[PDB]
Design a protein around this nucleic acid. Sequence first.
RNA 1: GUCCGCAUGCCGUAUCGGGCCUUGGGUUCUAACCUGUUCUGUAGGCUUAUGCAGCGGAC
RNA 2: AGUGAUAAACCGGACAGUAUCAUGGACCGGUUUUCCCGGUAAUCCGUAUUUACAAGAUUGGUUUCACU
DNA 3: TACCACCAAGCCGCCTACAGATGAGCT
DNA 4: AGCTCATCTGTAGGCCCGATGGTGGTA
DNA 5: GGCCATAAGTCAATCTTGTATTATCCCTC
DNA 6: GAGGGATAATACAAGATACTGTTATGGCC
Lengths: 305, 317, 306, 318
Amino acid sequence: LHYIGIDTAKEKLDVDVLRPDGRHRTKKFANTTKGHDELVSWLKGHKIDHAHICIEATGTYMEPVAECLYDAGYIVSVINPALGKAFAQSEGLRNKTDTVDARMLAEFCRQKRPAAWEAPHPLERALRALVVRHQALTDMHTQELNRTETAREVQRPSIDAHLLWLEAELKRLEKQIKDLTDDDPDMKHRRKLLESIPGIGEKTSAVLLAYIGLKDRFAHARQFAAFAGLTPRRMSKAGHVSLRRALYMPAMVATSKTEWGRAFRDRLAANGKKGKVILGAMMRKLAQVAYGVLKSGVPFDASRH
Amino acid sequence: LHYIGIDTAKEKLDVDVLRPDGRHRTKKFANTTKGHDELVSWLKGHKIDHAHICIEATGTYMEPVAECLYDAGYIVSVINPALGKAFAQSEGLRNKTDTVDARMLAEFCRQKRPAAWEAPHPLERALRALVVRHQALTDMHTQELNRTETAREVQRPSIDAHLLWLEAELKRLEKQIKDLTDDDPDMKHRRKLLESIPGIGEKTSAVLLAYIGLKDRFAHARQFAAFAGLTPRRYESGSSVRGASRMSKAGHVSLRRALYMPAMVATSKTEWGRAFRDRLAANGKKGKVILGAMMRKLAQVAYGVLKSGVPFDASRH
Amino acid sequence: ELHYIGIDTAKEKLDVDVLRPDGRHRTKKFANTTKGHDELVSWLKGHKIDHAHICIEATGTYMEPVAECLYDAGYIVSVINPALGKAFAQSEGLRNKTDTVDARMLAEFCRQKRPAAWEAPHPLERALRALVVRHQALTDMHTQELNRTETAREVQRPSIDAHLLWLEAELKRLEKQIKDLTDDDPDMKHRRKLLESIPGIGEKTSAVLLAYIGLKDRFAHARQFAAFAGLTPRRMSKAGHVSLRRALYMPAMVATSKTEWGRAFRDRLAANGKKGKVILGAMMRKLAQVAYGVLKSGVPFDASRH
Amino acid sequence: ELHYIGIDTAKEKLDVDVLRPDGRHRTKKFANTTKGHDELVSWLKGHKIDHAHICIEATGTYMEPVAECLYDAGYIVSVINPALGKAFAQSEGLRNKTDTVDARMLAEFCRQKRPAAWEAPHPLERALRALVVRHQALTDMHTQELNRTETAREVQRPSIDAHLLWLEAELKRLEKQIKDLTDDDPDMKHRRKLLESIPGIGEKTSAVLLAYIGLKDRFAHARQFAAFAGLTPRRYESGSSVRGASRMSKAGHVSLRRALYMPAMVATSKTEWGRAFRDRLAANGKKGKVILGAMMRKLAQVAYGVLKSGVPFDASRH
RNA sequence: GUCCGCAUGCCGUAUCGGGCCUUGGGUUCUAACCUGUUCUGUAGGCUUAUGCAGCGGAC
RNA sequence: AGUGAUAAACCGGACAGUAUCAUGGACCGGUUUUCCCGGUAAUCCGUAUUUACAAGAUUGGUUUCACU
DNA sequence: TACCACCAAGCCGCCTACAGATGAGCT
DNA sequence: AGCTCATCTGTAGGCCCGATGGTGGTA
DNA sequence: GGCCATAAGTCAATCTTGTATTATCCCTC
DNA sequence: GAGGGATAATACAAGATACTGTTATGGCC
Ligand SMILES: [Mg+2]
Ligand SMILES: [Mg+2]
């Protein structure tokens, strides 16, 4: 088994093979479809038919080659970049260059032996992309709302026109998301179970499903809550902001309007916890119950809480 | 002469009068048209005819009251908020650094006697409003344009549609600005003089007018350079202390923002610009340091030309 | 007919800025020397300046001679805390810092703020403080070498031991020098005896307190003295003499632990639910206030009042 | 066959964690005493642990005796830079319970990395470094008092003058004690003579350099000794976009880095080979202190070079 | 009711330190070239939230 | 200490933002310092958007409960 | 009358000015 | 043998630990 | 079956990669 | 003569004040 490290850039790839005997092989490639073919050819050139490849999450510049090597039939791992930086410091490295990083990643692979990566389902990729687009347009719509507060009279026609455009466009995406989840019989069913939870509506169901996916990729619900950066360490905040920000207003709706939510708020209030500390706790709980309900395959039963 | 201070908020006003004798008269008001009428009456109630009012520039909530008192005929000073905080710290070592109350503003007014404020011409306000809007739409366009780079294919129809809208809207505002400056013969002429400067185009001239204004508010061109936050901040003391000169940045950000690309166009493509670039480069100045220097020069020539009242002359450089 | 004068000070040079009643400025630079200081007094009297308020920032000890020179000439002198000067320059909206700008900034500070006048301290006050701060300097150095013995290699120990002996001997020499100083003067002898009467204050703390309070009662209220040490909260401000605050911590600790009036104070705050160091912080402030109080009363400490 | 052991050391206690080949752990705490260390060795020999690789943090003087003990017992001992330990913890997960490193973590550090073996210094190497470090302490105290002389009150001056005389005498005594140490050892005498042959390196710097280089040549290349002193430039590059500015890394012994500044200033100013080097970089757009930083690195590298070569400084090579 | 006097209550997390560890990247390849801003120090200044409560005195 | 179970309990302060304010040090002519008066589109002192923007990554600690 | 162990727990200042080191060539 | 002068904006990471003074109690 | 008001409000995740602005010159229909 | 593309610059640090929106549910028409 060889151990390969790839540093990624927009234009180039730096590759570092670490052979069983211990010697290295290094080569640069263009980060293109042609270059990716040159890479696989080069590996099979040196009779490397079994290898574990390690690569940092670097924008979306690492995604094409990761899929290419997965299809060629290698074990690919796409590591969190923060681990890589810490590992470099554990190795005592005194420089940051592309060839240094590529070699560092081969060692990371060998020593740590990280979990294998799997390309998401096309529908999961599509759903995620729409949910991310929807958040962007909501942010822009909120920016333009803030402006109406202090807008001059001459500025106001321009702002009103943009708000109309943004509202139509948000409405269009919400339909595109609905059509996506309705077509797939799995997603249609899984979304309806999420919405059974009091506090989770149309919007929050789409975001949860976009990050949970189709299959059960988490073994336990507490892992999903960790993935969202909601577990304490203060909250770690080591997880997707898009997922975490989506849960805040549902947390308020639950703690206030819903029966099971109030119960949680009251118990924590009795122990002496402040407003946002309870909301923090409820965010984590919603995440954890969301993954719970899906595993069960059964509508939200309030009796358990 | 009385010295009044007004601490402003969205909803409420807080007023503190300082009498010549030294006694105070304080009263809170609503921040409404009705509220502002009570204030003027309450001052004229206590036979306060001549006063110097000092308000701090918190935003658009304090503009109506400032205009109200200016019309009532009092002297109004609208002060930079950072001066207020600094003044409080000059008044003692153990002062609260999260408040400047109406009393503090009355003392500020007495000690410093700040320069009088003047309500901008309706035409100047309109121009500044459109220019500020244009910059906001430019920023939103840049955001969406950055997103095209890495966008997923399902996202691209949405982003493309938004870019078309934003481009059309930007083009509408540009025409709306042009129509404003053309309809006033003072602005039409002043804008033509600015655009005679190599490196100043349609977009930059509109910014420069919005801040320079109709009248000549500044006595000297160097003051306008300071106003934009472009002059180098010297830091020297005795023999030991020798800090490095840097751009002060203590000035209007929207001006400072507008001049960086003009500066880069001047030093690269124009004769008078390259001349300046070469001299500083010889003297050992780095690339972006020369841009900073050219930004200040453009500001200072912009004001100079308008004073001179004649097109840009290269012979002066 | 009062002029306003600002002086920015350096090791070598002075930068003077006279602001006249009519509102115009006169400026000149002088050497920071005895000869230079005489030229300044002459230059002022050559412009017919008899009355003037002079403002100068505390800048090491490089401004102490000129401040004394002008005070003798009959001018009003203010020595301002330089943190105030900086804030004022910001309030004035200045965009540069030079020796010429600062001299002009200080003349305006003088005109606008009209700060309190400065009084040159008594030679005895000036000597007592000199000895006390030197004593702390040696204590800090002794503590350094004492830390070193913990982890010292064997070959280093003869050197460290030798230094500890020398420092201990020197510390006794100063303690005697301080005792001799506050025995010759009848006023200091009485006042030092009054301070020691407080349970929690001994030989060392008494001399520190006497150095900062001084001979004459230059504070109006007790909390003013507590603020001068930086003990009043705002969480403690720290905006005061660190050498004075330093000196009260261990006195505070022995007071709350092994005195009647201290334990009484500790218990009161313990009942209301305060942490250990919060009570010490509180006792430091209280010790400062009582110390000042006892002196103004002029009678030994009485526990009844607390 | 090989076990991996981590030890977490405090002043009073030792926490030990043995990682067995199979994967199970053994844990037992000990006193940080001579009795404790003998108990530890017996406990390992109890469980038939003959070959092991122990990993300890370099926290100071409290961990040195147990390291000595285990080295003599015949185990492989590694004494790691604590900053590596903290970084290793963060490489194991994103949301660890604590940032603290424990004996278990150290045993895992040992397994994954197999760090280089530690070697107990020679008594004379230990003596020399101790004296040199004492000399730097007294120099700093002497500097303090010199600064005070400037702005002292006249009543304070008798005390400051007295202390200065004492410190001057003690520095002089301790310099002679260093000279007597190196003169008595024929190896150290020769190596010190070689270092002084370099223009820019005198008595004070040669002693510092020996204290960190030592009797035997531990570094494979001279550039590694420059890295050891923290004198090499740290590059920061990625892709087209990311491009930081190279600065002195400073990841290394401050004592070395402190010692070489004035030699570098003497070399670039007064010596033939150092003026040559100054002039070349000054021909490029390099500032004074930038050139000084470069010369500091060069002196470290040449110092180690000359010792390895075993022959006095040859100017021809520069 | 008002104005002063407080060694009063409420508010208060001091300050100085010490020791130890550190085996670059690229190149024309290791005492060469490109890439390099040391280690620390010193002195001085600091006048209430009397804000609110108590308590005492005067009118 | 390891393994399994967990929609329970203890630990938990989310994101995104918006608007607005800013009159150099000095130099060149008079006076013969500055100030003041007159002049400054020149020279020396300058690392923009006082947080420029975009994208991607993130599989808890512990307590109960079983088994070794 | 002189000597000794103990209290608290490691969690945060703002400014205005200053200075030293070592080694090689020159007196 | 003693003296002078060469450098000026600021910015590595971690882990282990100790002393101060004054008083009541003890010898 | 459709529309509005309300709940919280002091302060602090880590990294790996990218790109825009305006105005004048220059080349192409 | 109008329309569109290419181009210049790169280590980062260092002022204040006033404010607002998100979603999902149980209430109301
Ligand atoms: Mg990378
Ligand atoms: Mg000064």
